[PDB]
Design a protein around this ligand. Structure first.
Ligand SMILES: Nc1nc2c(ncn2[C@@H]2O[C@H](COP(=O)(O)OP(=O)(O)O)[C@@H](O)[C@H]2O)c(=O)[nH]1
Ligand SMILES: [Mg+2]
Ligand SMILES: [Mg+2]
Length: 167
């Protein structure tokens, strides 16, 4: 049993830092913005084991054969924005629309991820706005931090698996 998950969002919001924290349990700062890898691990979620196949998307400018196949065959999406980056929040609508267009569905497993909440002196998008926008798309909302010690990183990926299993 494999779940194919896709992490999407504007550049610089922490998709790589979240994915690396989830798989390798380390915080990698300033990770190369252009590397797009997928990662697989065998893990236990609610006493049910599964292989998690996670694509860390990078560089939506040019065509990515990797991203094309994961977007088409993916089982769930994490939509990440940074609470310190207003534009990454505003583009949540674009990613949401794109996922439903590719899947040709009125709804699909996704979770809205508000990252970098450890940066309390820089926070621009309030928790209210985030919950508002998740409510608007009728998807779950979770706040995360990839910096040690990490906040809700495992829970974000596991909750997406839970959404997929509860269809
Ligand atoms: N303080 C803090 N910094 C973060 C967090 N996540 C990412 N960063 C930093 O934000 C920048 C962009 O992160 P990155 O993982 O490369 O984002 P990506 O472009 O979406 O893959 C890097 O400088 C990271 O070190 C976080 O949760 N907290
Ligand atoms: Mg990256
Ligand atoms: Mg660690």
């Amino acid at each position: 049993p494999t779940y194919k998950l896709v992490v999407v969002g504007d550049g610089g919001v922490g998709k790589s830092a979240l994915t690396i924290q989830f798989f390798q349990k380390i915080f990698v700062p300033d990770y190369d913005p252009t590397i797009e890898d997928s990662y697989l691990k065998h893990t236990e979620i609610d006493n049910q084991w599964a292989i998690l196949d996670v694509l860390d998307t990078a560089g939506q400018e040019e065509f990515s054969a990797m991203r094309e196949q994961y977007m088409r065959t993916g089982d769930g999406f994490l939509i990440v924005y940074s609470v310190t980056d207003k534009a990454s929040f505003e583009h949540v609508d674009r990613f949401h629309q794109l996922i439903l267009r590719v899947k040709d569905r009125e709804s699909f497993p996704m979770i809205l991820v508000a990252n970098k909440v450890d940066l309390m002196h820089l926070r621009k998008i309030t928790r209210e706005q985030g919950k508002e926008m998740a409510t608007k798309h009728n998807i779950p909302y979770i706040e995360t931090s990839a910096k040690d010690p990490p906040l809700n990183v495992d829970k974000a990926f596991h909750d997406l698996v839970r959404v997929i299993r509860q269809q």
